[PDB]
Structure 1
Amino acid sequence: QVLEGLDAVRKRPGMYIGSTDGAGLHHLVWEIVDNAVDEALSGFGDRIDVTINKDGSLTVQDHGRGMPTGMHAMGIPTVEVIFTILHAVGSSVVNALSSWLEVEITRDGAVYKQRFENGGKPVTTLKKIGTALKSKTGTKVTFMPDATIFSTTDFKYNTISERLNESAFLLKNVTLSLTDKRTDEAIEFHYEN
């Protein structure tokens, strides 16, 4: 397996997300959402909240275990490795195609954050920013799609709502929410089995 950096994604985005139109833009949402859904399917977390922010960015929040907060080689956080090496995989592809991205992790009584800019270059390490109850766990990913790559950077509420509805139906017993801060629209989906 040949590992690559984020420049490879930026030079051939269609190879990773199919296209650079609205379909590709929304693939970025699906990758992040799917990672939160995988975590819930494994039994960690019973709600997944998606927000379309007024500035054009998009946030996904889960209440799963929290991405690992430790280090890989050479003092590099595991989360930085997840977000910056392409195993050619969604997290690194979204980072590559974002003008900025923030990941916030909560676990073990601590809240940590790392910020990337300009196609996924870290501008901070994984920094402890605060504290939380020892019981509190999860991951939050916010990203701004790169307007230099996509033909449209307008997330579509109806498109996202349909996909989260479907994902709630497949998962069971997990609430998926969508809030649009541009229009104030909001919806929740939950299917009990």
Structure 2
Amino acid sequence: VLEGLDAVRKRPGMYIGSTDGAGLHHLVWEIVDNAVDEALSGFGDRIDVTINKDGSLTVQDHGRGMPTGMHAMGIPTVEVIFTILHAVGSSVVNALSSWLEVEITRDGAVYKQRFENGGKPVTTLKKIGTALKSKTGTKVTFMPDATIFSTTDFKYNTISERLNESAFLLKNVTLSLTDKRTDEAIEFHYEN
């Protein structure tokens, strides 16, 4: 049985544990786990996480990029991933975000869709530019909903140690963290 995003908003703790500092960072693990699941599948050798000045957060990998095709009713596949809950991580974050943007680069084209106010699409998946055929990947940027979380301040140390673990488990893949609020940055990379 499928559910909408309002189902996650209704009982947020049931999907991310809680709505405090810990739960806020669960949002980060969800998106990153998808980039890591791409690397593990053999695509992309780096995953860059960026904490922006506006308080939002960005995860960018260099994998194959999420599918750019359509489904039923001319609804993009990426829209199905972010708005239909198969109750899975991508839609949960979108549901608990005041806005979210997904940027896909594949086949020499760059696509983009934006969501707002708990994952309501405000644009479709649009082709907005071109790129080299060698450049591929997915960029997700989201702003955690302040009317749901008790805190929307991402912790540099917390995200830091977790990327260190994920780097250690993956091997051969560099995960980075860049904080544009404080001009700090750090990388993790393990090899065997």
Structure 2 length-normalised TM? 0.99
Residue of structure 1 in register with 2:4 after alignment: 5
Question: Which residue of structure 1 aligns with residue 145 of structure 2?
Answer: 146
2:52 matched to which residue of 1? Answer: 53
For residues 119-177 of structure 1, give each alpha carbon's deviation from its aligned partner in whole angstroms, at most 9, with x where no partner exists: 00000000001000011110000000000000000000000000000000000000000
3-state SS of 2:124 partner: coil
In the aligned structure 2, how far is the partner of 1:72 from the partner of 1:161? Answer: 37
Aligned pair count reads: 192
Q: How much has 1:21 moved relative to structure 2? A: 0.2
Distance 2:13 2:21 in 1: 12
SS of residue paired to 1:111: strand
CA apart distance, 1:3: 0.5
TM-score by length of 1: 0.99
Deviations 1:37-72 (A, max 9, x none): 000000000000000000010000000000000011
SS of 2:87's equivalent?
coil
How far apart in 2 are the matches of 1:87 and 1:155? 28
* 2:86 partner SS: coil
**Gap runs ≥5 in structure 2:** none
- Cα distance in 2 for partners of 1:156, 1:47 equals 21
| Deviation of 1:192 (Å) | 1.2
SS of the residue corresponding to residue 161 of structure 2 reads helix
| Contiguous gaps of at least 5 residues in structure 1 | none
Deviation of residue 88 (structure 1)? 0.6
Cα separation, 2, equivalents of 1:86 and 1:66: 20
In the alignment, the residues of structure 1 paired with residue 23 and residue 87 of structure 2 have an alpha-carbon distance, to the nearest angstrom, of 18
SS at match of 1:159: helix
**Residue 109, structure 1, aligned to residue 118, structure 2:** no
Provide the secondary structure at the position in 1 that maps to 2:112.
strand
Distance in 2 between residues matched to 1:136 and 1:32, nearest whole Å: 20
Residues 90-109 of structure 1: per-residue CA shift (max 9 Å, x gap): 00000000000000000000
Where do 1:10-159 residues align within 5 Å? Answer: 10-159=9-158
Q: Distance in 2 between matches of 1:119 and 1:186?
A: 30
Q: Among all aligned residue pairs of Structure 1 and Structure 2, give the percentage whose two residues are the same amino acid.
A: 100
CA distance in 1, matches of 2:156, 2:129: 32
Q: Distance in 1 between matches of 2:51 and 2:175?
A: 14
